[PDB]
Swiss-Prot record, chain A:
Organism domain of life: Eukaryota
Species of the source: Saccharomyces cerevisiae (strain ATCC 204508 / S288c)
Miscellaneous comment in the UniProt entry for this protein: Present with 721 molecules/cell in log phase SD medium.
Compartment(s) of residence: Nucleus
Annotated function: Involved in pre-mRNA splicing by stabilizing the NTC (or PRP19-associated complex). As a component of the NTC complex, associates to the spliceosome to mediate conformational rearrangement or to stabilize the structure of the spliceosome after U4 snRNA dissociation, which leads to spliceosome maturation.
SUBUNIT field: Belongs to the NTC complex (or PRP19-associated complex), composed of at least CEF1, CLF1, ISY1, NTC20, SNT309, SYF1, SYF2, and PRP19.
Protein name: Pre-mRNA-splicing factor SNT309
UniProtKB/Swiss-Prot annotation, chain B:
Phylogenetic lineage: Eukaryota, Fungi, Dikarya, Ascomycota, Saccharomycotina
Organism per entry: Saccharomyces cerevisiae (strain ATCC 204508 / S288c)
Listed name of the protein: Pre-mRNA-splicing factor CEF1
Subunit architecture: Belongs to the NTC complex (or PRP19-associated complex), composed of at least CEF1, CLF1, ISY1, NTC20, SNT309, SYF1, SYF2, and PRP19.
Gene name per UniProt: CEF1
Task performed by this protein: Involved in pre-mRNA splicing and cell cycle control. Required for the binding of the NTC complex (or PRP19-associated complex) components to the spliceosome to mediate conformational rearrangement or to stabilize the structure of the spliceosome after U4 snRNA dissociation, which leads to spliceosome maturation. Its absence leads to an arrest of the cell cycle, possibly due to the inefficient splicing of TUB1.
Family (UniProt): Belongs to the CEF1 family.
């Protein structure tokens, strides 16, 4: 019965190690998403500016 | 054999029920722990995946 408790705890340690590295990968992705999403926002604003600018010139 | 069957199986039933009383509790202890491996494994794979 004691052996089975040593066997069990080992599995749940790996559950945490996987849990941490899985959340750690997603954590890095998050920053990337927010980096570019801003850059795309910057692009679209500039896009709309030209769109009306070119009209108001003509 | 009927003497043996009587003598032996009465001893067996006493040894069994004495063990069972002590060991059915420890079986449940050991068997409910086994079920924890089967869930500790199934989560392990989904996290690895």
């Amino acid at each position: 019965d004691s052996y089975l408790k040593h066997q069990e705890i080992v599995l749940d340690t790996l559950l945490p190690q996987t849990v941490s590295n899985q959340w750690r990968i997603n954590n890095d992705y998050i920053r990337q998403t927010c980096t570019i999403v801003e850059e795309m926002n910057i692009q679209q604003r500039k896009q709309i500016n030209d769109l009306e600018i070119y009209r108001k010139r003509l | 054999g009927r003497t043996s069957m009587k003598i032996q199986f009465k001893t067996a039933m006493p040894p069994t029920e004495v063990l069972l009383e002590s060991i059915q509790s420890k079986v449940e202890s050991i068997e409910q722990l086994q079920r924890k491996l089967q869930h500790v494994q199934p989560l392990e794979q989904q996290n690895n995946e």
